[PDB]
Design a protein around this ligand. Structure first.
Ligand SMILES: O=c1ccn([C@@H]2O[C@H](COP(=O)(O)OP(=O)(O)OP(=O)(O)O)[C@@H](O)[C@H]2O)c(=O)[nH]1
Ligand SMILES: O=c1ccn([C@@H]2O[C@H](COP(=O)(O)OP(=O)(O)OP(=O)(O)O)[C@@H](O)[C@H]2O)c(=O)[nH]1
Ligand SMILES: [Mg+2]
Ligand SMILES: [Mg+2]
Lengths: 468, 464
């Protein structure tokens, strides 16, 4: 199960999946027994989002065609609609009178996490700090159902682009696939659209595309407008084509996701695969990232809108660096992963060698056994006393090194020669992070966990996940 | 055959047709013998438009697939939309010449100044009008090219809208088209045991109009940026009938794309019938169109000018009023209809016969000589301030409203098709018609021929 194998398997599954707006009065078996007539169904689930929807995953892609064959355009408004046919259906009854089977309630797969205030109680009633972080992890991480929904969303966007770029794919990256995603996070999408004889050389006549950026802007502008007007479920479609990386933001109502669509950047795909590996190598890695993300949000260190704030990605890279520096390391360095690679795993982008192992079995398991109790406090202790003015984080080496340039917080981009991934960060925001980390370390170091439990007060992870 | 039967036959032929940009050095037999390997070829011809192109029409649609199978994408590259526009180059350009010249089917008419000589050398006026008709009317080749253009836009629209069809209307199919006229295209939308009624989830836009505007806006942009051969794409979505204008470079056609309007399809079929009923009808329209252009009565850009369509409707009215009529009234055609020909649109009954055989042939035998002069005589002395043209009744009637020139729209309750026309332009038309009548009535045709001067139709197709 390499990252790339998973992507391909997840996309092929989304390829043969549909969404169905269910009627208020729903008989599960009737619906499935009926749908089974178009072909076998591998998976399905239901979820709540302005009424009940169902994701159905067929075994054959031919089943989707078969279902579409018997699907019609709304009769009452056959002239007041844009007749774009997708895989978003609505299932009403021929004879509403002839409902003829018992009505069971249906199971709702949740697509959002419980809010922070509900979580704090669950954390206090835990036993140790280690358990607290696993509760939080369990409460926040992506479920199987949610993952399928994210891949489906990509597949629906792909179908628009394939109109004129048949070979195109739309693939998710970032949180949605790097194992560090939490429920409610955006779906980041990459559009990837570049993928006998005779006495004549016969060629199709085809319109030539502009220069990369200009092509990107036009392709995304048109896809943006299609989502807007061919819909049906897309709203709040914001074009941000003048950004460094041209972008389209939108909301997808059937699934409920906030989505960001841009043209493929092969570097960002490697970062996502890298984090996947680190995520898959040890469960403490994930448990630690989820807790420290939440911590950063709680104290206002991270924001949703860009600026001088530390970004979740940068913060995630610090956590990886920190884990590279343990005795013994919990995860390997990127150079260690490069040297475990072969010719099959060779990727070279923009000159620089972005190669590393894809098979996890070839990585030797860590000997480290530090508990999350120690690791959380040490994270705060470590970066609370890290000399940021003099040192930078190199994830290739796994070492503190001299800064290539005067910048408050320098984190070496592992896939681009001299690039600081946290270049946005100013001195004030860095100092506020350091102060928060120091306070967090102090609280954990000098608290009575038993006496706080007895008093029904916050303790451990819960004590650091509330304002100071 | 009926107008609808023809459309279907013409579209099916376009369905299994391709365009090929030929190489400069062209061997006809090699190309066809090769292409024949993919299947039998019913028709083909060549034409000039920034180099030589060829329309090839296969007998089987499978031949197009077979040809596409052996076709490649050209070696910031290209939008990989595969259509039926090909480029055949030579593998080895050097070891060729191969050099035998090819026949070019013309896609534009000879200009007015070249035509005047041909008209003077004719015998009668009747022949003049048939020369002009022959020189200007659409050829078979051109028709096929127009239907092909629609078929490609259909293929382009079917990317997002699989069920779509695109069909030409107006000049291109009503029999009154002349070479070089635009291709008007209509985009149309036409295509168990289970207990559920299953329907697509789609946004309900308030009006047909808003849907139309959005569909055409997106298709317009696609043609602009992804469409092969399409350029000069103008969006005119705020017009009465939302519209996208564009130029198609392989064929050379100026095209106008809009959403199907069932009224405009009926007008096209109506004019088809009148065109098919008698050759004098066409001969008369083509000459009077050209006459109107020559004296600046019609313009390409809209305004207060009389439009070719309005002018065509006057000519139809005039022919309804002959003794005996050359063509029937629309009410006569309605009453020859049956349940099969029943069309009711927007409340109003737009029904009429589609089978031409059920119309009794005209007994009229007036020559074009008489008919041309009479047209000018009739409308030269028509009282436009008091009367209006009703093509349903075939009668002069009182005007529903104060408008210089009122021509009743035959398919819509109180609508004047020539409402744009002001008093000055109407008066200039009347004056020109009167002068034209005077010239034809009081000229010596023999003495003008002897003197090598303009006479008859030629005398009225030059400025006064
Ligand atoms: O400086 C950067 C920032 C971001 N990226 C790449 O762009 C991706 C998108 O940036 P995000 O910050 O959205 O990543 P994310 O989805 O993992 O985090 P959250 O939304 O949960 O906050 C990141 O996952 C990273 O791979 C860079 O390569 N360099
Ligand atoms: O008042 C009008 C005007 C136009 N129409 C409808 O719009 C169609 C296209 O409008 P055009 O005026 O372009 O007709 P055309 O293409 O046959 O004429 P040329 O461009 O060759 O001069 C016409 O064929 C008619 O059916 C109306 O129904 N009513
Ligand atoms: Mg994001
Ligand atoms: Mg036209």
């Amino acid at each position: 199960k390499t990252f790339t194998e998973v992507q391909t398997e997840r996309l092929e599954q989304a390829d043969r999946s549909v969404l169905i707006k269910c009627p208020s009065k729903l008989n599960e078996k009737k619906l499935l027994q009926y749908l089974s007539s178009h072909g076998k169904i591998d998976n399905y689930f239901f979820f709540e989002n302005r009424g009940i929807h169902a994701l159905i995953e067929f075994s054959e892609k031919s089943s989707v065609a078969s279902l579409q064959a018997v699907t019609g355009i709304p009769k009452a408004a056959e002239h007041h609609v844009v007749p774009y046919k997708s895989r978003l259906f609505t299932f009403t009854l021929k004879n509403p009178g002839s409902q003829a089977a018992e009505e069971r309630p249906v199971k709702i797969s949740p697509q959002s996490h419980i809010p922070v205030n509900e979580l704090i109680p669950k954390l206090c009633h835990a036993d140790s700090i280690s358990s607290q972080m696993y509760i939080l992890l369990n409460e926040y991480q992506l479920t199987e159902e949610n993952i399928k929904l994210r891949y489906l969303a990509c597949s629906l966007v792909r179908d628009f682009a394939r109109a004129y770029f048949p070979d195109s794919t739309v693939k998710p990256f970032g949180s949605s696939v790097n194992t560090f995603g939490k429920l409610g996070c955006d779906v980041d999408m990459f559009l990837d659209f570049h993928d006998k004889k005779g006495p004549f050389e016969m060629e199709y006549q085809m319109k030539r595309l502009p220069s990369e950026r200009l092509a990107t802007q036009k392709i995304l502008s048109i896809i943006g407008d299609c989502l807007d007007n061919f819909g049906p479920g897309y709203s709040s479609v914001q074009k941000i084509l003048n950004a460094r990386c041209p972008l389209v933001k939108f909301s997808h109502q059937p699934t409920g996701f906030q989505c960001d669509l841009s043209v493929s950047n092969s570097i960002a795909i490697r970062c996502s695969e890298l984090l996947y590996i680190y995520g898959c190598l040890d469960p403490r890695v994930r448990a630690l990232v989820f807790s420290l993300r939440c911590w950063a949000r709680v104290h206002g260190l991270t924001n949703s809108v860009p600026g001088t704030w530390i970004t979740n990605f940068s913060l995630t890279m610090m956590i990886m660096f920190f884990l590279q520096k343990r005795s013994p390391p919990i995860i390997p360095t990127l150079d260690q992963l490069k040297e475990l690679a072969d010719e099959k795993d060779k990727h070279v982008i923009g000159g620089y060698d972005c190669s590393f192992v894809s098979d996890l079995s070839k990585i030797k398991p860590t000997k480290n056994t530090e508990t999350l109790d120690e690791l959380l406090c040490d994270f705060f202790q470590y970066f609370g006393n890290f000399d940021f003015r003099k040192n930078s984080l190199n994830l290739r080496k796994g070492k503190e090194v001299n800064k290539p340039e005067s910048s408050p917080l320098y984190i070496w981009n592992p896939f681009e020669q001299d690039l600081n991934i946290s270049k946005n960060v100013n001195q004030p925001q860095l100092e506020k992070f350091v102060a928060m980390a120091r306070e967090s370390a102090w609280i954990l170091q000098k608290e009575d966990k038993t006496q706080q439990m007895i008093n029904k007060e916050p303790w451990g992870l819960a004590a650091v996940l509330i304002p100071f």
